[PDB]
Design an enzyme around this catalytic site. Structure first.
Site, PDB file in Angstrom:
ATOM      1  N   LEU A 114       0.823  -1.286  -0.303  1.00 30.51           N
ATOM      2  CA  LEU A 114      -0.154  -0.203  -0.090  1.00 30.51           C
ATOM      3  C   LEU A 114       0.849   1.300  -0.156  1.00 30.51           C
ATOM      4  O   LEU A 114       1.837   1.230   0.489  1.00 30.51           O
ATOM      5  CB  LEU A 114      -0.845   0.225   1.283  1.00 30.51           C
ATOM      6  CG  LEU A 114      -2.339  -0.827   0.848  1.00 30.51           C
ATOM      7  CD1 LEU A 114      -3.508  -0.540   2.499  1.00 30.51           C
ATOM      8  CD2 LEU A 114      -2.699  -1.013  -0.436  1.00 30.51           C
ATOM      9  N   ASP A 115       0.314   1.853  -0.608  1.00 26.38           N
ATOM     10  CA  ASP A 115       1.230   3.033  -0.836  1.00 26.38           C
ATOM     11  C   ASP A 115       1.572   4.221   0.770  1.00 26.38           C
ATOM     12  O   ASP A 115      -0.190   3.754   1.101  1.00 26.38           O
ATOM     13  CB  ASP A 115       0.573   4.568  -1.735  1.00 26.38           C
ATOM     14  CG  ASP A 115       0.691   6.103  -2.068  1.00 26.38           C
ATOM     15  OD1 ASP A 115       2.022   6.162  -1.568  1.00 26.38           O
ATOM     16  OD2 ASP A 115       0.688   6.494  -2.983  1.00 26.38           O
TER      17      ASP A 115
END
Ligand code: SF4
Ligand code: SF4
Lengths: 118, 114, 77, 186, 209
Positions: C37-38
């Site tokens: 996940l960013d």
């Protein structure tokens, strides 16, 4: 006694001599802390002392007003108070020192954008 | 090629992200209110999606100072949307729905003029 | 205390989250790289927890947390 | 008169230094004024009176005016006493026009004379400042006196040379009068 | 014997001249230069850091007592490495004289705020921020003033097209006003009004590096 100061907010103040004297004392000490080679110092003493020496001879407030000029006592005290803040800030500012920054070349030159002969 | 210069807000790239992400919080949290307050077609998911792309609009910003200003702009626009100073026209502006995406491939450009 | 409640709520966030891989979603799954996940995804994820827990978390928590267990620690907090 | 409240030197007039007396006749006067609204009665009777002044409405469009010979209105391209176009395309009018409302394109007519082909004014950009006519070296273009030139369509306002020449023909007599009035004076 | 040519107030030049040296030798660290423009006004060229100290010095000290801050005039000049220049034009009722303070800054570094010195300036800093983008540090609220909401760019810069990049209209599909790329009925016709012949020798070599 003068009825009004002619200005809104600026109220008639009694014991002006006491207030002016007290203000002059504090500012003199405030400049006292300054270094002895500061032009700001050199002049403030002579100016303030000239004022604080004129404060006495003229018990009448109106007489003092004429002698000191520069406006009426009601504003005049404010002038003194301003300078008190100035000295406290001035000591905190150290502006008697030398140039913090030299302007880049061609900074303060007018007109702009003209070629030059090296 | 470095210069010893004043700051604006953020002294290091991480503080810059800290400020930048704070803004992202306000904007994410605001979106639902604007969907309600501003009677415009846009829906929450689309507004959220645009907010993502519009940060991606400038990913390769590098200077600490530049990224600081971008955040300064955002904090402003946040407040202008937080309070309702803006107008439905102004808020929709981010979509540019008046003009069709102009042709891009060479023939469509060529056949449609410079 | 209430560790079922904290774990239950914490799990359901990422369990029921877009942009995520269900498997590999361990409580020891680092949001950043393990979970893929960013950081922006990470910010919205922690917020969804602020939604599901109604809790005002500091931004410093962002780096002080890495993994769903980490926020479990901050949630039972 | 009551005394002042702040002593005034010259070069000034304090508009509130007058004191509100506490003399019994003075207070009872003010009290009676409030109890029977004397001041309102003074103002009341004023407006009654001022019905009896004749209104100054001009019965437009029958009655109308006044203007002055310098009034800046509809534009017009004049013609010499022979009928020849005065404009020579010197293009100063365009060069000065603050709004850049003038566009000119000139060539040689077959006679070899320096004359315009297109001469355009946009009276949705013109400010009727009159810099054009003050600049023109042969009085070719002038702010004619007409001012009731109102149109239902925006396109109808963009005058070209044909429209401007027509106005010059239409208004030539009046424009001649004004210039005879102001040429030696302008 | 030249009625066309005015004659300035010489005694005013005297007082301003000596006073100007007073300021220079009282604020050595800040005042970079003090010059007397031929229009009898007095300019005080300072470094960006001393902005508040100079203003505070002026408004307060007896000899200055320059209380009113008339405006904050912003000037843009490319080809100066830090181009954006600022002008603080002050008045002194006690002595009936005017003074100008000036400073520079680039499009990036921030600048000191006069909000804490003169309450009068508050709106002006907002105005320059909107019109040039010169940030102000410690300014209470730096909201834009003039330009419309969501306006990008600061138009008073000289690298900004006169007519702007976009313009508005009204849509019927959307019952709303939309901004569109620029489209001009008649392109603004510049005129190249450049002097071929130097009409002023006196400024030719004067003020050289
Ligand atoms: S200034 Fe007069 S003569 Fe010259 S182009 Fe204009 S209208 Fe013609
Ligand atoms: S009146 Fe002024 S603005 Fe109008 S066309 Fe003449 S010069 Fe231009």
């Amino acid at each position: 006694i003068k009825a009004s100061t002619g200005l809104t907010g600026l109220a008639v103040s009694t014991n002006p001599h006491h207030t002016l004297s007290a203000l002059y004392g504090k500012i003199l000490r405030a400049v006292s802390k300054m270094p002895q080679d500061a032009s700001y110092r050199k002049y403030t003493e002579q100016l303030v002392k000239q004022r604080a020496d004129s404060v006495a001879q003229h018990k009448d407030i109106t007489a003092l007003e004429k002698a000191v000029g520069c406006g009426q006592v009601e504003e005049l005290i404010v002038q003194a108070e301003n300078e008190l803040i100035l000295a406290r800030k001035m000591l905190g500012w150290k502006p008697w020192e030398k140039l913090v920054q030299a302007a880049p070349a061609k900074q303060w030159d007018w007109p702009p954008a003209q070629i030059m002969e090296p | 090629a470095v210069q010893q210069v004043r700051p604006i807000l953020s002294v290091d790239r991480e503080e810059a992200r800290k400020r930048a992400l704070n803004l992202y919080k306000a904007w994410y949290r605001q979106i639902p209110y604007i969907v309600m307050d501003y009677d415009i077609p846009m829906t929450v998911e689309q507004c959220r999606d645009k907010l993502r792309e519009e940060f991606v609009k400038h990913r390769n910003v590098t200077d600490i100072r530049v990224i600081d200003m971008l955040v300064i702009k955002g904090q402003m626009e946040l407040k202008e949307s937080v309070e309702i100073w803006k107008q439905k026209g102004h808020i929709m502006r981010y979509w540019k729905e008046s003009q069709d995406p102009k042709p891009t491939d060479f023939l469509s450009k060529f056949i449609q003029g410079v | 205390l209430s560790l079922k409640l904290i774990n239950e709520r914490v799990l359901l966030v990422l369990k029921l989250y877009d942009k995520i891989d269900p498997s590999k979603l361990n409580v020891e799954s680092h949001f950043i790289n393990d979970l893929g996940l960013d950081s922006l995804d990470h910010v919205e994820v922690i917020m969804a927890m602020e939604d599901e827990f109604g809790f005002e978390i500091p931004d410093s928590d962002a780096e002080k947390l890495l993994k769903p267990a980490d926020i479990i620690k901050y949630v039972a907090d | 008169e009551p005394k002042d409240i702040v002593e005034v030197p010259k070069g000034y007039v304090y508009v509130n230094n007058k004191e509100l007396s506490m003399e019994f006749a003075d207070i009872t006067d003010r009290a009676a004024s409030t109890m029977f609204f004397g001041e309102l009665l003074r103002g009341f009777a004023v407006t009654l009176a001022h019905i009896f002044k004749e209104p100054a409405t001009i019965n437009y469009p029958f009655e109308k005016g006044p203007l002055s010979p310098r009034f800046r209105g509809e534009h017009a391209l004049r013609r010499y006493p022979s009928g020849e176009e005065r404009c020579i395309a010197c293009k100063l009018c365009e060069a000065i026009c603050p709004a850049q409302a003038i566009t000119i394109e000139a060539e040689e007519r077959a006679d070899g004379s320096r004359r315009t082909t297109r001469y355009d004014i946009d009276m949705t950009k013109c400010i009727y400042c009159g810099f054009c006519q003050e600049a023109c070296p042969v009085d070719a273009i002038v702010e004619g006196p007409n001012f009731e030139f109102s149109t239902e369509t925006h396109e109808e306002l963009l005058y070209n040379k044909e429209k401007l020449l027509c106005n010059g023909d239409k208004w030539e007599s009046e424009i001649a009068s004004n210039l005879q009035a102001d040429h030696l004076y302008r | 014997d030249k009625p066309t040519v005015r004659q300035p107030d010489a005694v005013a030049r005297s007082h301003l001249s000596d006073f100007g040296r007073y300021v220079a030798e009282c604020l050595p660290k800040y005042v970079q230069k003090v010059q007397l423009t031929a229009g009898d006004e007095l300019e005080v060229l300072i470094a960006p850091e001393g902005v508040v100290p100079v203003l505070q010095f002026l408004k307060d000290h007896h000899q200055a007592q320059f209380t009113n801050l008339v405006d904050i005039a912003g000037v843009d000049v490319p080809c100066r490495k830090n181009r954006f220049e600022v002008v603080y034009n002050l008045l002194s009722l006690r002595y009936n004289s005017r003074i100008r303070v000036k400073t520079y800054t680039d499009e990036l570094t921030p600048l000191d705020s006069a909000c804490e010195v003169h309450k009068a300036a508050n709106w002006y800093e907002r105005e320059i921020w909107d019109m040039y983008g010169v940030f102000f540090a410690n300014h209470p609220d730096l909201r834009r003033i003039l330009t419309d909401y969501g306006f990008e760019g600061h138009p008073q810069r000289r690298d900004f097209p006169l007519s702007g990049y976009v313009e508005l209209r009204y849509d019927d599909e959307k019952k709303r006003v939309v901004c569109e790329p620029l489209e001009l009925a008649q392109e603004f016709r510049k005129f190249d009004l450049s002097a071929p012949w130097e009409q002023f020798p006196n400024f030719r070599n004067a003020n050289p590096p």
